[PDB]
Amino acid sequence: GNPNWETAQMIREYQSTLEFVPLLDGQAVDDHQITVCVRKRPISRKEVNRKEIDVISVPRKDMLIVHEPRSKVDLTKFLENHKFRFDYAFNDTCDNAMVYKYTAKPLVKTIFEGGMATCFAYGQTGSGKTHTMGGEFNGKVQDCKNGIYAMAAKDVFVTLNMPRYRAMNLVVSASFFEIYSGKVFDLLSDKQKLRVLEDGKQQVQVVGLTEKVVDGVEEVLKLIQHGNAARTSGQTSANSNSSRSHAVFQIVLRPQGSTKIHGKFSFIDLAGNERGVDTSSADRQTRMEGAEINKSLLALKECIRALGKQSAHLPFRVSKLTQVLRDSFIGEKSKTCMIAMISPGLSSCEHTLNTLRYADRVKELVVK
Amino acid sequence: MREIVHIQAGQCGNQIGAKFWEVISDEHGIDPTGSYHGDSDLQLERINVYYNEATGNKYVPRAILVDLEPGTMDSVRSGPFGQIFRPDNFVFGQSGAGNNWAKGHYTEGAELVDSVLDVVRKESESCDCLQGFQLTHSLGGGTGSGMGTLLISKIREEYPDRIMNTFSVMPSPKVSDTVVEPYNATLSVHQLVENTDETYCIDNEALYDICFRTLKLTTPTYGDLNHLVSATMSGVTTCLRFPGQLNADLRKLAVNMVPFPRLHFFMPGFAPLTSRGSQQYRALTVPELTQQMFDSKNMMAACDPRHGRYLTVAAIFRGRMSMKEVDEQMLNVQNKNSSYFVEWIPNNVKTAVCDIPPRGLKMSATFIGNSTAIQELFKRISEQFTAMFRRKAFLHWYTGEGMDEMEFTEAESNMNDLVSEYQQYQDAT
Amino acid sequence: MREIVHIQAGQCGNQIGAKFWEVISDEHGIDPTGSYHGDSDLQLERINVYYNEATGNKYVPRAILVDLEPGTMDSVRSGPFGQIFRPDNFVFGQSGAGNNWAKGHYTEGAELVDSVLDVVRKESESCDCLQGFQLTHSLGGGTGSGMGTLLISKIREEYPDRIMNTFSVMPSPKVSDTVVEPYNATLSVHQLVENTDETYCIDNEALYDICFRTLKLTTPTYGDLNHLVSATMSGVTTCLRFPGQLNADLRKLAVNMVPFPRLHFFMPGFAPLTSRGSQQYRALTVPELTQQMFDSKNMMAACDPRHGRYLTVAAIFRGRMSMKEVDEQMLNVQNKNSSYFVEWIPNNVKTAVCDIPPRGLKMSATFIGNSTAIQELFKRISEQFTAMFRRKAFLHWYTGEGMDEMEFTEAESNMNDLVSEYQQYQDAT
Amino acid sequence: MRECISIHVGQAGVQIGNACWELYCLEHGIQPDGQMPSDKTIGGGDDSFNTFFSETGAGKHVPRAVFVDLEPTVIDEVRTGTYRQLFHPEQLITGKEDAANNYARGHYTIGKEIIDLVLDRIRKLADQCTGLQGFLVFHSFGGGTGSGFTSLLMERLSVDYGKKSKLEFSIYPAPQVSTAVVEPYNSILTTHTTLEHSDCAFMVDNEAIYDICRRNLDIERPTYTNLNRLISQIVSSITASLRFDGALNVDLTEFQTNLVPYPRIHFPLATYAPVISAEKAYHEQLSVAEITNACFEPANQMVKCDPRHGKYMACCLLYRGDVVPKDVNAAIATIKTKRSIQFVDWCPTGFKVGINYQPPTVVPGGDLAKVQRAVCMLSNTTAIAEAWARLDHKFDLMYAKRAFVHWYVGEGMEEGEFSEAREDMAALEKDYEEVGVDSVE
Ligand SMILES: CC(=O)O[C@H]1C(=O)[C@@]2(C)[C@H]([C@H](OC(=O)c3ccccc3)[C@]3(O)C[C@H](OC(=O)[C@H](O)[C@@H](NC(=O)c4ccccc4)c4ccccc4)C(C)=C1C3(C)C)[C@]1(OC(C)=O)CO[C@@H]1C[C@@H]2O
Ligand SMILES: CC(=O)O[C@H]1C(=O)[C@@]2(C)[C@H]([C@H](OC(=O)c3ccccc3)[C@]3(O)C[C@H](OC(=O)[C@H](O)[C@@H](NC(=O)c4ccccc4)c4ccccc4)C(C)=C1C3(C)C)[C@]1(OC(C)=O)CO[C@@H]1C[C@@H]2O
Ligand SMILES: Nc1nc2c(ncn2[C@@H]2O[C@H](COP(=O)(O)OP(=O)(O)OP(=O)(O)O)[C@@H](O)[C@H]2O)c(=O)[nH]1
Ligand SMILES: Nc1ncnc2c1ncn2[C@@H]1O[C@H](COP(=O)(O)OP(=O)(O)NP(=O)(O)O)[C@@H](O)[C@H]1O
Ligand SMILES: Nc1nc2c(ncn2[C@@H]2O[C@H](COP(=O)(O)OP(=O)(O)O)[C@@H](O)[C@H]2O)c(=O)[nH]1
Ligand SMILES: Nc1nc2c(ncn2[C@@H]2O[C@H](COP(=O)(O)OP(=O)(O)O)[C@@H](O)[C@H]2O)c(=O)[nH]1
Ligand SMILES: [Mg+2]
Numbered sequence A: 001g002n003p004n005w006e007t008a009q010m011i012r013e014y015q016s017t018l019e020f021v022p023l024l025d026g027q028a029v030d031d032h033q034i035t036v037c038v039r040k041r042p043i044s045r046k047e048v049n050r051k052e053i054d055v056i057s058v059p060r061k062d063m064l065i066v067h068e069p070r071s072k073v074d075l076t077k078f079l080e081n082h083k084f085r086f087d088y089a090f091n092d093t094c095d096n097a098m099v100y101k102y103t104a105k106p107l108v109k110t111i112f113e114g115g116m117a118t119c120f121a122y123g124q125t126g127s128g129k130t131h132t133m134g135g136e137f138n139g140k141v142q143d144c145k146n147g148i149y150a151m152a153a154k155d156v157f158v159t160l161n162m163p164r165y166r167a168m169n170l171v172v173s174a175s176f177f178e179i180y181s182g183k184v185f186d187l188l189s190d191k192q193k194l195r196v197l198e199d200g201k202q203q204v205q206v207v208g209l210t211e212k213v214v215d216g217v218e219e220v221l222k223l224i225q226h227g228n229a230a231r232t233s234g235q236t237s238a239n240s241n242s243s244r245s246h247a248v249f250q251i252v253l254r255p256q257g258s259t260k261i262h263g264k265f266s267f268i269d270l271a272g273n274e275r276g277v278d279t280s281s282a283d284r285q286t287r288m289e290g291a292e293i294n295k296s297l298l299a300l301k302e303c304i305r306a307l308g309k310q311s312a313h314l315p316f317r318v319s320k321l322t323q324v325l326r327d328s329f330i331g332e333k334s335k336t337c338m339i340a341m342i343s344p345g346l347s348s349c350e351h352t353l354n355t356l357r358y359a360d361r362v363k364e365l366v367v368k
Numbered sequence B, C: 001m002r003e004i005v006h007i008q009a010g011q012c013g014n015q016i017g018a019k020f021w022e023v024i025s026d027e028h029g030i031d032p033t034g035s036y037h038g039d040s041d042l043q044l045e046r047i048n049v050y051y052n053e054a055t056g057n058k059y060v061p062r063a064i065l066v067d068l069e070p071g072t073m074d075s076v077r078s079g080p081f082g083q084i085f086r087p088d089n090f091v092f093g094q095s096g097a098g099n100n101w102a103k104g105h106y107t108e109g110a111e112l113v114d115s116v117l118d119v120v121r122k123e124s125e126s127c128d129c130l131q132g133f134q135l136t137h138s139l140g141g142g143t144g145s146g147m148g149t150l151l152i153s154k155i156r157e158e159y160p161d162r163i164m165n166t167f168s169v170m171p172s173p174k175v176s177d178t179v180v181e182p183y184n185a186t187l188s189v190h191q192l193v194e195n196t197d198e199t200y201c202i203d204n205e206a207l208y209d210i211c212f213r214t215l216k217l218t219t220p221t222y223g224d225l226n227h228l229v230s231a232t233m234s235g236v237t238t239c240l241r242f243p244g245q246l247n248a249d250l251r252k253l254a255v256n257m258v259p260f261p262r263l264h265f266f267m268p269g270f271a272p273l274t275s276r277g278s279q280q281y282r283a284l285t286v287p288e289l290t291q292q293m294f295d296s297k298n299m300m301a302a303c304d305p306r307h308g309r310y311l312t313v314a315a316i317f318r319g320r321m322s323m324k325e326v327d328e329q330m331l332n333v334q335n336k337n338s339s340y341f342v343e344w345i346p347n348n349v350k351t352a353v354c355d356i357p358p359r360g361l362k363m364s365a366t367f368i369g370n371s372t373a374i375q376e377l378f379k380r381i382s383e384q385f386t387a388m389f390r391r392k393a394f395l396h397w398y399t400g401e402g403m404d405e406m407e408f409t410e411a412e413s414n415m416n417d418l419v420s421e422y423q424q425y426q427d428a429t
Numbered sequence D: 001m002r003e004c005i006s007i008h009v010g011q012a013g014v015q016i017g018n019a020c021w022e023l024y025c026l027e028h029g030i031q032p033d034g035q036m037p038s039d040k041t042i043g044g045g046d047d048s049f050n051t052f053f054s055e056t057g058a059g060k061h062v063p064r065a066v067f068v069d070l071e072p073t074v075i076d077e078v079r080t081g082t083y084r085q086l087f088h089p090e091q092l093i094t095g096k097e098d099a100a101n102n103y104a105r106g107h108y109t110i111g112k113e114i115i116d117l118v119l120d121r122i123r124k125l126a127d128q129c130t131g132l133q134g135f136l137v138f139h140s141f142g143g144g145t146g147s148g149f150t151s152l153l154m155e156r157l158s159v160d161y162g163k164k165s166k167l168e169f170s171i172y173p174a175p176q177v178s179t180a181v182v183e184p185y186n187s188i189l190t191t192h193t194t195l196e197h198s199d200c201a202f203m204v205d206n207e208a209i210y211d212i213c214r215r216n217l218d219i220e221r222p223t224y225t226n227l228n229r230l231i232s233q234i235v236s237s238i239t240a241s242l243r244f245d246g247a248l249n250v251d252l253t254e255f256q257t258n259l260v261p262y263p264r265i266h267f268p269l270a271t272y273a274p275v276i277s278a279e280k281a282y283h284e285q286l287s288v289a290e291i292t293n294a295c296f297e298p299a300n301q302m303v304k305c306d307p308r309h310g311k312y313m314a315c316c317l318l319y320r321g322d323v324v325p326k327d328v329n330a331a332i333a334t335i336k337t338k339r340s341i342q343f344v345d346w347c348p349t350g351f352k353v354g355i356n357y358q359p360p361t362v363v364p365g366g367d368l369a370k371v372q373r374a375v376c377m378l379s380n381t382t383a384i385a386e387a388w389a390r391l392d393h394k395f396d397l398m399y400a401k402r403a404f405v406h407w408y409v410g411e412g413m414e415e416g417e418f419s420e421a422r423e424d425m426a427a428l429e430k431d432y433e434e435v436g437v438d439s440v441e
């Protein structure tokens, strides 16, 4: 309605004193083998009706700044520039969905180049991340023509149909898992636990898995449905469905019947987190659950703080998912990336900021 | 208040408790019958932590004796305190593991664990609120190796957020009392890294050096070896039973003493330790005990602490003391020996002060350290392990019980990562 | 006040009462002669429920002993309490059923039931007002199977609105003590579904497990097996004899414990049960008894209650207690085990508190449950039944006594509907 | 009559609480059964003051006491000791688990289901009072309840009681000796809310009061019984203005306007004059100018810090007993004369004199004895900035190595809360640079 408008007067002054190099989805997104990208959701019509104030600058292609109001020791307003050098800094206005393609392009190569090209989706509740990987891209009714996975699950058959890659006698195969309750449940069986061990070559060896073949870009979506048809875990009407399962979408590439693997993907879904202390456990059940998550997520960046550094030692064993993905952290031809999703709330700045603290341990470097 | 369930596995483990449960009852003043006849009432203030009440003024120790595979059983019943356990808690079977891991964890454990886990839930709901699961067993053997680790997989599953300590007697690097001793170490610790909060890694050779070099004893019997270990146990739960000016929960230890969720392998320590008649030529002070605690020949770990780096230590002090002397002696050690420690940790020592000593003494202490000097021990076992497996030595007593070759490769690389990620932190970084 | 007629059928049934009638007289303090020598007068307040007066201060148990087919008779007379029954109530015949149903219900019963039903009406009109018809017998055998069900067809006809309990010892699914045991089960229960208000379905294998696993007994005799059953009977009519702060009629049970007029097949339970000398290491409280009552190995039913769903349970408590502890322990069980019960019933538990314990104890209890876990038992008998009938095994001992083939098809489909309509309610709907 | 509300948060506060109320009942002639048989003989005075006490119809006097520690082990010494029948038996034990020295278990996971038992118990006790509410919170840093439960206590009482007085006495950890290794983590996570809600934040230290027991008291063996009695003398040298007839009685609110220049910088760093032994009561006069000059020395501080590396902003001299005001102002310009203790430009005035004419009394059973006069300087400085450099560098040491973090992240807190608490202390300790640097022209 009418918050402090001078809040916005503080914002615009930094804007009209500098260059700004925006970034759109109409350019060749080059390759690095590693990154952490960004994409925010647009300001809603409601937030405008409530006069929500801008909080972001997009000064550059690989950097973003937050506009935090503060106060001094005489109640004088102060503004902070949260200078965050990152790799890819996309706007909420530029959502043409090529971000996935620009993220897929390096990865669509690797498995077909014989490598382990993985990813993760990281973001706050209501930050638009279910609109970012699970699809579809319309923002209205999730119209079943723009499945964001299908923008490279097309590639699974179309880049397969690449005559350069038609030479390779390769099979379609993949696997969905459930990292939850400190255990591994199958999304194909799909109520049973499996166990996973290593090889003399320090591979990974699942025990009792269903490996599914498909000639359908929707047949894999059926297994995402049938995979989600477990509808686990921790379901309620809270966060949001709260059916929080760290949903592994892993790929199994090899020849027709040779049993010899020529690469991998693993694209993983974040769980359903709880907004600080706003939730309630009221049970030793839930008091376990979020604790397991908030550790299991934290340890992930650590071996990446070992691998993205880069370093040598690597403790993949505190989390089973890193025991699943100890493989991925080792290959030289093994890409990785991860995505940030943001909400324009000013109350969200307390959490969209805690979002970004998690990815900073690459030791990015602002030269400004 | 919080209460503690006490579990015993292996032929070793209940023999530890058989002296140990005598110590606690003498710490409060309780007969073989359960009739309390202590001196003061201050020992009555936390009876509930181990002992629950019975009908006529009787106290029953909450001890679930899994390891009474029948030869070991009658000795416990025909002991000094066979008339103190509730006889329905003697949960056991027939024709035991036979120093086989798979006969402890895969075949006979499945014919006993349903009879065990129920009796766990019996004493569980008789408690107001739980934290304590003190498993007393050894590595290397049978029941303590396969049947011991089976409960720790299960009781963690029914109780995800409870304190899990296992005071496991480790193998010895020179005195090998078991031919299959590396094959029981690698498998059982592979459970322990996954599902323990802390453990008290104890060797017998360290107990051998302490009883002979320090206590000057001619013939140390296993009751006298374990009485050293029994001193560790009662010292740690001193503050959860007695009012202290700086208290010590198990969880207060189990947030301070562990930096990283995997590295929770502890070495204990105890002082005073002397050999005398009734005239001994010394004087008990705070720097008297302090120098004794940090001695390389006063470890129950069988390693040189000066070879590794202390990650963190725990000084749990008992008896009447003075905090400044306690503070500055812990200060002076971190000063004069700063090159020993992990340097990139601000404080490397914590304290804990109970206010009541044991019966005979006037002051006492309990050292608990966690070092990169225990990096030696698993290196002194995994090398013994990897010589047996390349020649594929004892496989037909294991593959014929329900195991697999891929299980052994999975087992050691768990242990290979600990010694690898102790080298990261013994290095000056 | 209301009074109870007590009937015994079968070789099993009077052997149950022979210990049981000793218990009631010792519950009040009555000699073998009928001379009352109890301690207080509170046990005198409801003598009339079982015992009517005689000439000089003597009390006579209203027990009509149908089953004294003459071999069983003299043992009852040459027992501890042969000098307590009115000898005209020994109603019997010659050349009995011989473990044949039709020889109990069709041929020799017609030559005895007119001598029985009159003696029923004798003790009937000596009562002020009736409710109680406690038939004590077994299934599986002879007199308890054919002659037992004959009275229940008749006494219901003369007394349509009276409480009808039969504490029938059921067959055992493994220990088969009778070759024709499924043929006596299917026929006699076909009477019981039609004309009983409640029944206490009891197995001997459940009595076998209780006497051995829990009571730790070497050689359980049938006096000691049935003494467990005798504890059930006196516990239920405790409140109809003793003043309790939450009373318990048979009909108060027989409106609460039954949802639907056909499904009235109950399993009993009892606590405390222990093995000791005189020192036992426990303590009697309300949560002490509560956990013991709901145990799968503390059922007299020989089934896993966790396999089925409890429709409803009945906690009949004796001795001095506290209602909040009684309330919350029944509350906590329905909370922690809510997936076990029938979920679409608001409260799944009721209580009943008498104020007077038995002689030796200080507190006691009596569990009565009704479950879809008894769906197992008739399934474990009707499968044994249907293997005999397809080969038409023992028909010439039945068709030659006045039966028909169409009677057997009619008999099992009654029983086939109970297991069918227990599947409707063990399902989560 | 004005009043004060005592909340001894956690185990350090209860040990302090064992002596504070002990000292008061000795001052007001009160036995441990709440009676006053001494003024039954005299028959005058309301000396069981509405400052700290109520009175039932039998004459038994009841404190304004309440205390929470989340573990029954500490409070049972009270409920079995000499002070069993003194307090009202709603002493909130209620801990099914000790907080285990982390902030998260703590403000987040187990502070719930206990705080509603606390705040309700407060407002029952608050309605016994007529006028000035003074919260006196007694917590340490480093402990679980002293940091976790304290941070819950402020943002709930700040809503339920508006803008009344909050006097919270934080035991600040030493830059040299810490009895806990995770203690630098608790001592920064509380600072996100200690800075915001709390009115006045005292600091003391053990390593300062250890030196004083060997130097001024001359005892080689200090125990917490003899440590906390000096902090007990600090409080009684404050609240005596709310109790006793003094030449310049000073309300708690008079502290607040004076000692707090800017709304966040309230850290006023108490001292005392404890040179008693009591052989050194002889060989020594201890006039006004004698005990005034004790405030000079960095060896007389209660915080292990040199005052000579910054500026002062405000001071508060509070005198007890046989004090003459002309002797005060003599002992003031001498402190203005010395150019080493130095002020800022923007506070040319400086001091504030408060004078009771009732001296403190002797705690029997050791250690000190009857001195005729006393002093409690209350003075924030800019020198307290470098004590936080002696804590943040400890904090930033074990942050890069991701230590101790799973017992915070898995207990209801995000890892983003740590860099929130870091940039709080990064911004706050930066602001002390803005104070001493004066705007020259
Ligand atoms: C005259 C005198 O002071 O004798 C001492 C004594 O000489 C010494 C050598 C004792 C003695 O201990 C041993 O010789 C010993 C034997 C087997 C295993 C371990 C030790 C002593 O036996 C042990 C005994 O310990 C206790 O009384 C403690 O309360 C101890 N109790 C038991 O271990 C115990 C023993 C038997 C039955 C019940 C309990 C304890 C320690 C920690 C926690 C709980 C209890 C003490 C002080 C002494 C003797 C009697 C000689 C020492 O041990 C202890 C545990 O105090 C050995 O080094 C210390 C130093 C003592 O000064
Ligand atoms: C020293 C002491 O306390 O001894 C107890 C005893 O040890 C235990 C083990 C008793 C004992 O019972 C049995 O061993 C037993 C034998 C056959 C069948 C069933 C039980 C006891 O015999 C049984 C006896 O029971 C009674 O006195 C009741 O009043 C009981 N009476 C009879 O069953 C009875 C027996 C013989 C003659 C007349 C009556 C009763 C129970 C319900 C309703 C009415 C009466 C009691 C408490 C004990 C002994 C004596 C050892 C237990 O049984 C009962 C019924 O109380 C078995 O588990 C309980 C727990 C008792 O503590
Ligand atoms: N001066 C003084 N310091 C104390 C006292 N008790 C504890 N401390 C200090 O306080 C810190 C430990 O915090 P405690 O107050 O004991 O912990 P707590 O608040 O009870 O929290 P938990 O025990 O963790 O639940 C250490 O720095 C101790 O030196 C005391 O009585 N006096
Ligand atoms: N990038 C985007 N562009 C346009 N609209 C968007 C975008 N992201 C989200 N929206 C719209 O914002 C609304 C909320 O998005 P949604 O993906 O449902 O949120 P969420 O993060 O899944 N919330 P929740 O399930 O409650 O935790 C929907 O109406 C979307 O269509
Ligand atoms: N400290 C100690 N060690 C023991 C004891 N008994 C056996 N051991 C050790 O335990 C291991 C053998 O296992 P044991 O417990 O006897 O086998 P189990 O009965 O199959 O569990 C070896 O390392 C022995 O040295 C004992 O009483 N005390
Ligand atoms: N519990 C119990 N069961 C009995 C007893 N006597 C016989 N039975 C059981 O009763 C059945 C045999 O019937 P029984 O009463 O002896 O035959 P009847 O005389 O023809 O009625 C079998 O299932 C036996 O196991 C007894 O005294 N107690
Ligand atoms: Mg959503």
Ligand SMILES: [Mg+2]
Pocket: B247, D010, D011, D012, D069, D071, D098, D143
């Ligand atoms: Mg505490």
